[PDB]
Amino acid sequence: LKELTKQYEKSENDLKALQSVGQIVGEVLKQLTEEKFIVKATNGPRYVVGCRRQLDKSKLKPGTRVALDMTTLTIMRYLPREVDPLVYNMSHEDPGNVSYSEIGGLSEQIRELREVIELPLTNPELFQRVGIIPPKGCLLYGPPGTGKTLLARAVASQLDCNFLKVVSSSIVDKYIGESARLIREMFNYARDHQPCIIFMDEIDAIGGEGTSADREIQRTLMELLNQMDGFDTLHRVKMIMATNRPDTLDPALLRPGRLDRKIHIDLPNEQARLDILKIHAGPITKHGEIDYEAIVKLSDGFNGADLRNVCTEAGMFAIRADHDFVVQEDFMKAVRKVADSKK
Amino acid sequence: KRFKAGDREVQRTMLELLNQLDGFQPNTQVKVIAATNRVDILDPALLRSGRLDRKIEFPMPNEEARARIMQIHSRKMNVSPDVNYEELARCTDDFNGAQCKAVCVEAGMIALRRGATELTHEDYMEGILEVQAKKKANLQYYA
Numbered sequence: 001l002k003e004l005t006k007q008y009e010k011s012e013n014d015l016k017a018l019q020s021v022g023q024i025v026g027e028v029l030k031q032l033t034e035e036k037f038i039v040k041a042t043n044g045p046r047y048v049v050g051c052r053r054q055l056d057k058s059k060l061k062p063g064t065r066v067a068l069d070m071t072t073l074t075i076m077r078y079l080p081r082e083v084d085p086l087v088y089n090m091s092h093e094d095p096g097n098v099s100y101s102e103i104g105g106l107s108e109q110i111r112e113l114r115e116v117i118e119l120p121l122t123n124p125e126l127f128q129r130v131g132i133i134p135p136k137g138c139l140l141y142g143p144p145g146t147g148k149t150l151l152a153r154a155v156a157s158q159l160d161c162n163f164l165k166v167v168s169s170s171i172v173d174k175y176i177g178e179s180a181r182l183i184r185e186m187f188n189y190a191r192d193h194q195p196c197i198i199f200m201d202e203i204d205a206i207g208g209e210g211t212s213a214d215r216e217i218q219r220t221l222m223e224l225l226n227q228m229d230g231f232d233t234l235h236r237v238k239m240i241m242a243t244n245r246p247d248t249l250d251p252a253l254l255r256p257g258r259l260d261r262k263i264h265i266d267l268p269n270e271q272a273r274l275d276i277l278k279i280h281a282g283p284i285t286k287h288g289e290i291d292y293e294a295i296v297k298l299s300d301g302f303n304g305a306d307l308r309n310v311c312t313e314a315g316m317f318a319i320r321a322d323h324d325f326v327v328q329e330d331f332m333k334a335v336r337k338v339a340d341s342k343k
Numbered sequence: 344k345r346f347k348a349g350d351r352e353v354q355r356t357m358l359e360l361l362n363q364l365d366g367f368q369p370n371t372q373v374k375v376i377a378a379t380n381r382v383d384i385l386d387p388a389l390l391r392s393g394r395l396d397r398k399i400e401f402p403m404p405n406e407e408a409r410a411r412i413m414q415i416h417s418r419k420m421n422v423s424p425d426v427n428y429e430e431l432a433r434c435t436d437d438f439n440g441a442q443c444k445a446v447c448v449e450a451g452m453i454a455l456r457r458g459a460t461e462l463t464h465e466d467y468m469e470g471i472l473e474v475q476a477k478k479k480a481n482l483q484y485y486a
């Protein structure tokens with residue numbers, strides 16, 4: 001009887017459901033009066049629609065999704081904003097829970113970047129107590145592959161804020177106006193989702209003359225500088241715009257409220273190689289002792305990514321073998337092949 | 344790449360694809376591969392960690408690779424025992440593997456035109472000349 005009791009109550013709920021009818025999902029676009037709205041269906045015409053009495057007038061702001069009755073055409077209840085991986089921008093990318101200890105040997109540079117970006121986003125009370133508008137933007141310059149992007153992801157992970165990564169060389173398109181249009185869409189996108197780390201890649205394409213194609217780079221540069229510092233909303237989002245050649249950069253692009261603080265990130269420091277190998281090879285199972293100084297001396301002019309490839313390729317050598325990392329000769333040949341074959 | 348136009352249907356397909364590559368974590372037996380002749384027009388969102396990754400690099404075959412490739416696609420054909428595939432590779436430059444098979448096909452076709460069973464080296468040379476639509480004319484000013 002009891003199991004019949006449960007399934008019969010469920011069946012009666014189903015019977016009540018059969019009488020229930022659906023509502024067209026709609027979106028409010030205007031509020032004429034305190035009983036008048038302009039609601040547009042997802043795929044349908046626009047109707048002048050009223051609201052149910054058991055519903056707050058204020059909550060139905062322009063852009064509030066609603067589910068009106070499909071016969072009387074009256075709003076019955078609000079709905080929160082629709083969610084879907086339909087976003088066309090990089091915000092949905094997660095920088096990954098990587099700490100500042102993961103990037104090794106940039107302690108000074110890490111600290112300057114924290115002071116520039118983390119402070120205005122976490123504790124603005126210091127900046128408002130002093131009386132200065134909080135700084136926005138840090139410029140990381142150095143050899144390619146040194147880990148500026150990893151640094152940006154580490155900041156975006158510690159701050160737990162949305163992160164946008166963009167290849168600046170990709171944004172300059174042959175067709176006119178799309179190069180500045182991409183920056184415009186990027187910034188208006190950052191306006192809605194706040195706070196934002198706007199990490200831009202090598203700017204030398206955008207930042208730094210008698211032809212239309214050359215004046216296009218000028219126009220997109222002006223659009224960029226207008227987006228960072230200027231009219232509309234001065235906003236709170238931050239930029240981790242990084243370049244490869246700092247002399248090419250426009251002097252106006254280096255200003256306090258306009259991407260100051262040229263942080264130099266040179267090739268992994270002499271002591272930094274040891275730390276990088278510790279963080280990127282420690283996860284790899286290896287019971288054998290390490291002669292790290294020998295690897296560091298055998299890896300001169302290496303960049304941060306090279307060490308990760310050394311670790312992965314040493315793992316690969318182990319894969320082509322017993323399975324356990326036991327010998328330094330593997331690190332030697334890994335370094336050599338990450339030296340000659342990565343050239 | 345991304346760009347209300349009528350491309351907002353394949354866009355949903357690509358985004359659904361992106362959702363499924365990021366939905367499943369590694370160490371499972373769902374290894375994916377993808378092929379394309381133009382990554383210049385590919386959305387880099389597809390080429391991000393958790394998505395495809397590990398971009399394998401396919402170059403135009405070098406001389407020895409071209410000779411080897413031209414050797415494979417002639418095993419089913421009665422090629423003469425004396426055909427210098429290495430010299431064929433020297434005379435075939437800037438040639439993809441598809442053309443390195445088309446040269447063998449055209450050599451066989453020209454041999455059929457000549458009414459011969461086995462393919463001589465000259466048939467392969469004429470295939471090389473004909474795979475790129477060139478016509479060989481005996482110019483008088485060389486001698």
Ligand SMILES: Nc1ncnc2c1ncn2[C@@H]1O[C@H](COP(=O)(O)OP(=O)(O)O)[C@@H](O)[C@H]1O
Nearest residue numbers: 102103104144145146147148149150276304305
């Ligand atoms: N200083 C570093 N410490 C630890 N890992 C690094 C460092 N530099 C680079 N890497 C590794 O290289 C990979 C890619 O580096 P990336 O951030 O693209 O360098 P860049 O920003 O200079 O192009 C990262 O996944 C990271 O693991």
